[PDB]
Design an enzyme around this catalytic site. Structure first.
Site, short mmCIF file in Angstrom:
data_model
loop_
_atom_site.label_atom_id
_atom_site.label_comp_id
_atom_site.label_asym_id
_atom_site.label_seq_id
_atom_site.Cartn_x
_atom_site.Cartn_y
_atom_site.Cartn_z
N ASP A 5 0.86 -1.18 0.00
CA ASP A 5 0.00 0.00 0.00
C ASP A 5 0.90 1.23 0.00
O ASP A 5 1.60 1.49 0.99
CB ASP A 5 -0.93 0.01 1.21
CG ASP A 5 -1.60 1.36 1.41
OD1 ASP A 5 -2.25 1.84 0.46
OD2 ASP A 5 -1.47 1.93 2.51
N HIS A 33 -5.95 33.15 -5.66
CA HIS A 33 -6.28 31.93 -4.95
C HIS A 33 -6.95 32.30 -3.64
O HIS A 33 -6.36 33.03 -2.83
CB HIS A 33 -5.04 31.06 -4.73
CG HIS A 33 -4.50 30.45 -5.99
ND1 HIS A 33 -3.27 30.77 -6.51
CD2 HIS A 33 -5.05 29.56 -6.84
CE1 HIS A 33 -3.07 30.09 -7.62
NE2 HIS A 33 -4.14 29.35 -7.85
MG MG Z 1 -4.14 36.18 -4.12
MG MG Z 2 -1.49 3.72 3.61
MG MG Z 3 -3.91 3.05 0.27
#
Ligand code: MG
Ligand code: MG
Ligand code: MG
Ligand code: MG
Ligand code: MG
Length: 1312
Positions: free
Chosen positions: A8, A803
């Site tokens: 994983d 942003h």
């Molecule tokens: Mg900005």
């Molecule tokens: Mg993991």
């Molecule tokens: Mg995973």
RNA sequence: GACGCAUAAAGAUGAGACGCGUUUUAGAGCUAGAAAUAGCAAGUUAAAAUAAGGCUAGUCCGUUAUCAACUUGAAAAAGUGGCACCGAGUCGGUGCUU
DNA sequence: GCTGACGTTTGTACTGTAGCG
DNA sequence: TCTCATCTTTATGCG
DNA sequence: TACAGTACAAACGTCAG
């Protein structure tokens, strides 16, 4: 004997689990090296390797380009000095030496301490005559006297140092545009053929209204001088030769082919930028700055009188305390003008006579500085006009500025073109330029030294892909006519049709495909099947009706470039001709390669005999971008040597076989495949050689090293099966199509629901909406998001993308975090979300956009975040979505690299034997496995959940493979279709369950022992395999390892801190002592070293032997590694034992009394290093007591699990006993544990959900890594930072192999 | 049963620039005092540096990626750690075997 | 005489704090 | 923050 | 989340009686 491996992989972790064929995790008595008495250890072969996430190259590049800008800026200043040098040495043999030694203190300066004049008295009569640089600039411009070279230098050098932006093509100039009388010239010109508009906010909405108040001859005329009009059709009420008209962006000569436009456009645009020409000057910017300074002076004179006569007690807090965001904090402190305005507006509201100041604050005029965040709006041509005026006065007195005026004129305006790159001489890996001669590059000789054309072609050719099938061959342009034909014939070779008489559907013959393409792909840009069945089958084939298949109701393919070249090259037979096809390909290749018009002309010049100059003038505007996946050689260069056809010939006609690109290049009967496989080192070199970000190279390389180390563990025998968890998905076709709806429809539905006519005023296409600014413009219904102002679609560079949550706070580059806004409003919200006042004034308009669904609820939450205005480190508790893309990229690569590393034996019967069967599971299978049989997952307790996921991946993958080896091709590497696949992969897991329940309540009993069909072999024993996996889920020993990492990057924090008599400041330059000059602070330790040495100690100094950590900073690291012992002697250490020096990177692991572990975070901070092995019953309880009402199961299944929580109410207290015992063992934050116990006892009566959803936070006290703040309901627990490192010097140091199986343990008690 | 076509989302790599911000210095502080400072005046600007620096000296490079330990090796790179069973609070015990 | 008084003179917890549009 | 260019991954539709 | 600013507590000489 046999075994398997599960993996994983995440952004900061790889979990790994060796499993037997029995699904058991094995264990071995491993040998351990080092001086300690312990010689062997029992370890399970399950674990997780933890590493900090790799950084993207973003920060490094934004530092690199900055370094180049400062180097080039100083060189501009130096060429200016070179022109000034023989003349400056007349008035001042040391003026440039004084500007250079300006930073030094009075006794460090070799010359008298005042930079420009040297002497005090002239420097002060100077600042009295010219209080800023702009009174200088203005007096230089409007007056005609002979003036001082030292001050010419400073005015020019200031303008050359701070030269303003280049986002405006060509030039503006004030000299043609100062005076508003141009409307008289305009109406006089139209008869051959005030501030009335500008007094309000500029857009077509005001301009038309004003001019109609003052049909086409006035307003429709003047907008062509003022606006980028939307229709492409020709103008009206116009010149004797008729064409389109607009104030076009790049080249207004594209409109003049139907003077005063230049004058009036410069006038309106400069008077939009500057609040000037209510007064007449020749230096408009300096006049505006002087007006700012004088207004600031009169405003402060009024303000302090008002404060003293009505609030005299308040004065010091505003005007002396520089920490308060008062005027002292605005000027002498760090406060911005927004902070000063919000500070001072409450004080102004209660005084009298303040109405004018309150009016000015609302327009942002109140006490402005001259140099501010919104000066980025100033184009360089304004500075250029001031510099030209300066030189044109002074030339009557300075002969030398007459002689070389244009060299200084060149120096400010010279900018390296972006397609040329850094001007190296071979030693820069970023450099692609080619220089004609070995001469040094100057702004004057640039055009004769640098081959711009070859460098500009190389700029693209270094970046565009090689063809994946022909890795030595660069790809076509996307719009190349060869690629157009390829695309249409690739699609159309596989469509099928049937009529009432036919027995079965049939392919289009070669005749038919040729006819369809020339009929309608060359006469419609995109063809619908409605158009296909009507215009071809009904009109050419005379069918009454037909069913077509193999394509949706709109074809994907297009010959749009044919339509472009047909609109331009009028001879259609030229485009259908065979001989000239190479020349047309070169035309489209050039027109993709180049955008600078001059090199476009210089490249297309060789074909000027085939077309007229009017067509050539048309060709050089037809910009193209994008590159196909394939090379020319592939699609129509190579031929199958048996049959003789190229790929594009086969797509044009392949008999009835009608093969597409895939079955062509995979047919053994066609030697394309032979050509591919003859056209087609170590692990670290390979991992460096991949494309993509450097960030993903970490997680790939570490997990390959993990797998090789596991192979080393198991007697160098390879595993049977390797299972990698993929961050991949399946969806219903309706969800996935909704998840990928064309972004025009997103705009149209919302605009119709809010009912505006913006798409009538500004029509737009889905191809155009790929532009980010334009997409945001339509998403915002043509208005700014931070002031109630109509945006302009033509000027979208002076508007900029805010942003909403800043990138410095949180990485979020999504549409949900992007806002198109005016540049000043964006830069007025540095490091913040929008202010409370702007939320109050626009939350209604944001709600109108939300109700009309152009913005999401998340976007509304980010815009209105001042209502929840934390921006704290505790608000970080959702994943940035970059971690998902990195996980996807890493796991995709590791699949193919482990397949290449494991399955290496070629064979002649079939090409490669699967010695090791590498498996790539989608996460939904393991997730459903976890949630079906109550093997729940809680991320906050401890890090064993990575290893448990790898274990369950190996278990589930091997169980599915051995249960369905007929279905091997669905997992092993190498209502709608997607909905059918989704239900199939949902139902494929049914073999793990004992009971299958239908929606009507029917139940089917499944066998307790699962077997495959084709060999009858046992695979999943629901008696003992579930007990086995529950046993493996309950192991208390899991090999968690944190990677030891030498730190890299910034030497310190970036902020420069003022002078002090403290020795810890970093000397910011070699000869600048920080007791005098200040310096950097917060240095970053690359690694600690264990030093053993004497030190001279005591007020009567004497040698004491000492062992300690020394934190080698990144700055000093190379000096240390050149020669350690003299570096230690420079640090003051004596009689150092060289061989006993031990390198200790960050997260070096130490073990201490009662099993306590500490990770060395520096020479002067540790981190908690153990993991709580909490039993599974309490874990599943915590997950079920959390999530309590939001379980996805049926109400009966929710109820029984919600009762499982109630059946275990007493689990709450024993978890606190567990945490108490663990925290006493390892964490030693006794005050924090007492606070945790007291808070728990304060809330033992609250709902068992809220208790669990806060007990889940107490494991922040216990979890491995850095101490962090956490809260249990109201009570907040402060981090017990382990700033002492004294204990690890006599601990045992653990050097861990990359899995954590093998160890070297050093007992540092024996060292000294 | 991993590829180029269309769409979309989320990201990435490189080049050229802009605006700031910070730091030290410069922009004579004045008056009253034994005084430390207090009152008062002032403030808006500029230079220089903006990773320390480096050698191929370029209007270039210097914050990404690579790193357990040990033996070989300039480095790349190669090499180095018995097994089964009964158990399990971070691994223990038992038995073969070298 | 020699225990301790009284400064200096170092060595530990707690809150801040970090280049950015 | 701006301009310009290219490219990865994932998901859906068509082969 | 490692280090900085900084308020706070042991240790090390010369007196003190
Ligand atoms: Mg900005
Ligand atoms: Mg993991
Ligand atoms: Mg995973
Ligand atoms: Mg890094
Ligand atoms: Mg598809």
């Amino acid at each position: 004997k046999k075994y398997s491996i599960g993996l994983d992989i995440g952004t900061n972790s790889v979990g790994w689990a060796v499993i037997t064929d029995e699904y058991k995790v094995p264990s071995k008595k491993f040998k351990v090296l080092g001086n300690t008495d312990r010689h062997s250890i029992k370890k399970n072969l399950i674990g997780a390797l933890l590493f900090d996430s790799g950084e993207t190259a973003e920060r490094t590049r934004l530092k690199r380009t900055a370094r180049r800008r400062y180097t080039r800026r100083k060189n501009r200043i130096c060429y200016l000095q070179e022109i000034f040098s023989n003349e400056m040495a007349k008035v001042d043999d040391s003026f440039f030496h004084r500007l250079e030694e300006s930073f030094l203190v009075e006794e460090d300066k070799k010359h008298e301490r005042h930079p420009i004049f040297g002497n005090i008295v002239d420097e002060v009569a100077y600042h009295e005559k010219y209080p800023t640089i702009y009174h200088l600039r203005k007096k230089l411009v409007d007056s005609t006297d002979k003036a001082d070279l030292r001050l010419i230098y400073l005015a020019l050098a200031h303008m050359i140092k701070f030269r303003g932006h280049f986002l405006i093509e060509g030039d503006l100039n004030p000299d043609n545009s100062d005076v508003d009388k141009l409307f008289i010239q305009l109406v006089q010109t139209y008869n051959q053929l005030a501030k009335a508009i500008l007094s309000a906010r500029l857009s077509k909405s005001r301009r038309l209204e004003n001019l109609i108040a003052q049909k086409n001859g006035l307003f429709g005329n003047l907008i062509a001088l003022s606006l980028g009009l939307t229709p492409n059709f020709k103008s009206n009420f116009d010149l004797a030769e008729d064409a389109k008209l607009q104030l076009s962006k790049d080249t207004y000569d594209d409109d003049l082919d139907n003077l005063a436009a230049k004058n009036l456009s410069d006038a309106i645009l400069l008077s939009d930028i500057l609040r000037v020409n209510t007064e007449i000057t020749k230096a408009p910017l300096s006049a505006s700055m002087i007006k700012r300074y004088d207004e600031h002076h009169q405003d402060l004179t009024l303000l302090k009188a008002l404060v003293r006569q009505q609030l005299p007690e308040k004065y010091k807090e505003i005007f002396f305390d520089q920490s308060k965001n008062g005027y002292a904090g605005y000027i002498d402190g760090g406060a911005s003008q927004e902070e000063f305005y919000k500070f001072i507006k409450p004080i102004l509201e209660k005084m009298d006579g303040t109405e004018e100041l309150l009016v000015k604050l609302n327009r942002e005029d109140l006490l402005r500085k001259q140099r501010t965040f919104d000066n980025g709006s100033i184009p360089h041509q304004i500075h250029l006009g001031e510099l030209h005026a300066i030189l044109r006065r002074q030339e009557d007195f300075y002969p030398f500025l007459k002689d070389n005026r244009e060299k200084i004129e060149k120096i400010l305006t010279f900018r390296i073109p972006y397609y040329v790159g850094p001007l190296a001489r071979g030693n820069s890996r970023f450099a692609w330029m080619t220089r004609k001669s070995e001469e040094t590059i100057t702004p004057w000789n640039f055009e004769e030294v640098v081959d711009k054309g070859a460098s500009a072609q190389s700029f693209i050719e270094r970046m565009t892909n090689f063809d994946k099938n022909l890795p030595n061959e660069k790809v076509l342009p996307k719009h190349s006519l060869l690629y157009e034909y390829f695309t249409v014939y690739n699609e159309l070779t596989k469509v099928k049709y049937v009529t009432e008489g036919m027995r079965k559907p049939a392919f289009l013959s070669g005749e038919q495909k040729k006819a369809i393409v020339d009929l309608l792909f060359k006469t419609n840009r995109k063809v619908t099947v409605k158009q296909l069945k009507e215009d071809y089958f009904k009109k050419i084939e005379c069918f009454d009706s037909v069913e077509i298949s193999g394509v949706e109701d709109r074809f994907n393919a297009s010959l749009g470039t044919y339509h472009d070249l047909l609109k331009i090259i009028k001879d259609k037979d030229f485009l259908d001709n065979e001989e000239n096809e190479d020349i047309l390909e070169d035309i489209v290749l050039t027109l993709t390669l180049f955008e600078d018009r001059e090199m476009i002309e210089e490249r297309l010049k060789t074909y000027a005999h085939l077309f007229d100059d009017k067509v050539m003038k048309q060709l050089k505007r037809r910009r193209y971008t994008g590159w196909g996946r394939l090379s020319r050689k592939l699609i129509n260069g190579i031929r199958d040597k048996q049959s003789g056809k190229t790929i594009l010939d086969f797509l044009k006609s392949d008999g009835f076989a009608n093969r597409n690109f895939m079955q062509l290049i995979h047919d053994d009967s066609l030697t394309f495949k032979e050509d591919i496989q003859k056209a087609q080192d170590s692990l670290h070199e390979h991992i460096a050689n991949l494309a993509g970000s450097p960030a993903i190279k970490k997680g790939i390389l570490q997990t390959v090293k993990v797998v090789d180390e596991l192979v080393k563990v198991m007697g160098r025998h390879k595993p049977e099966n390797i299972v990698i968890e993929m961050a991949r998905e399946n969806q219903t076709t309706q969800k996935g199509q909704k998840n990928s709806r064309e972004r025009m429809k997103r705009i149209e539905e919302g605009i119709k629901e809010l009912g505006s006519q913006i798409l009538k005023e500004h029509p737009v296409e889905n191809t155009q909406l790929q532009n980010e600014k334009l997409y945001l413009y339509y998403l915002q219904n043509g208005r700014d998001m931070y002031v109630d102002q109509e945006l302009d679609i033509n000027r979208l560079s002076d508007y900029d993308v805010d942003h909403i949550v800043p990138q410095s706070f949180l990485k979020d580059d999504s549409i949900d975090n992007k806002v198109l806004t005016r540049s000043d409003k964006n830069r007025g919200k540095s490091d913040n979300v929008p202010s409370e006042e702007v939320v109050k004034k626009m939350k209604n308009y944001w709600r109108q956009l939300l109700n009309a669904k152009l913005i999401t609820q998340r976007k509304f939450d980010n815009l209105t975040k001042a209502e929840r205005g934390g921006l704290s480190e505790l608000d970080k508790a959702g994943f940035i979505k970059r971690q998902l893309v990195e996980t996807r990229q890493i796991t995709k690569h590791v699949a193919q690299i482990l397949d290449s590393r494991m399955n290496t034996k070629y064979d002649e019967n079939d090409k490669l034997i699967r010695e090791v069967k590498v498996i790539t599971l989608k996460s939904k299978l393991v997730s459903d496995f976890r949630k079906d049989f109550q093997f729940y997952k809680v991320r906050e307790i401890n890090n064993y959940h990575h290893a448990h996921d790898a274990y369950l991946n190996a278990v589930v993958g091997t169980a599915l493979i051995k249960k369905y080896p007929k279905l091997e091709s669905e997992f092993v590497y190498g209502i709608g279709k997607a909905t059918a696949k989704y239900f199939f992969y949902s139902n494929i897991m049914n073999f793990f369950k004992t009971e299958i329940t239908l929606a009507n309540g029917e139940i089917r009993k499944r066998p307790l022992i699962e077997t495959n069909g084709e060999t009858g072999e046992i695979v999943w024993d629901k008696g003992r395999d579930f007990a086995t996996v529950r046993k493996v889920l309950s192991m208390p020993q899991v090999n968690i390892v944190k990677k030891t990492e030498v730190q890299t990057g910034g030497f310190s924090k970036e902020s420069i801190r003022p002078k002090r008599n403290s020795d810890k400041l970093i000397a910011r330059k070699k000869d600048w002592d920080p007791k005098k000059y200040g310096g950097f602070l917060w240095p970053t330790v690359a690694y600690s070293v264990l030093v053993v040495a004497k030190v001279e100690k005591g007020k009567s100094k004497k040698l004491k032997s000492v062992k300690e950590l020394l934190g080698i900073t990144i700055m000093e690291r190379s000096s240390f590694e050149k020669n350690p012992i003299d570096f230690l002697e420079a640090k003051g250490y004596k009689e150092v034992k060289k061989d006993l020096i031990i390198k200790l990177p960050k997260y070096s692991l130490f073990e201490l009394e009662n099993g306590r572990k500490r990770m060395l975070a520096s020479a002067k901070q540790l981190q908690k290093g153990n993991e709580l092995a909490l039993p599974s019953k309490y874990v599943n309880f915590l997950y079920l007591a959390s999530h309590y009402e939001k379980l996805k199961g049926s109400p009966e299944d929710n109820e029984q699990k919600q009762l499982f929580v109630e059946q275990h109410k007493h689990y709450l207290d024993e978890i606190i006993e567990q945490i108490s015992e663990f925290s006493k063992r390892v964490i030693l934050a006794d005050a924090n544990l007492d606070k945790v116990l007291s808070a728990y006892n304060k809330h033992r009566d609250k709902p068992i959900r809220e208790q669990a959803e806060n007990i889940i936070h107490l494991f922040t006290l216990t979890r491995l890594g850095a101490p962090r703040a956490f809260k249990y309901f109201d009570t907040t627990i402060d981090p017990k930072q382990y700033r002492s490192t004294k204990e690890v010097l006599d601990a045992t140091l653990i050097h861990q192999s990359i899995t954590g199986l093998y160890e070297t343990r050093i007992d540092l008690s024996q060292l000294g």
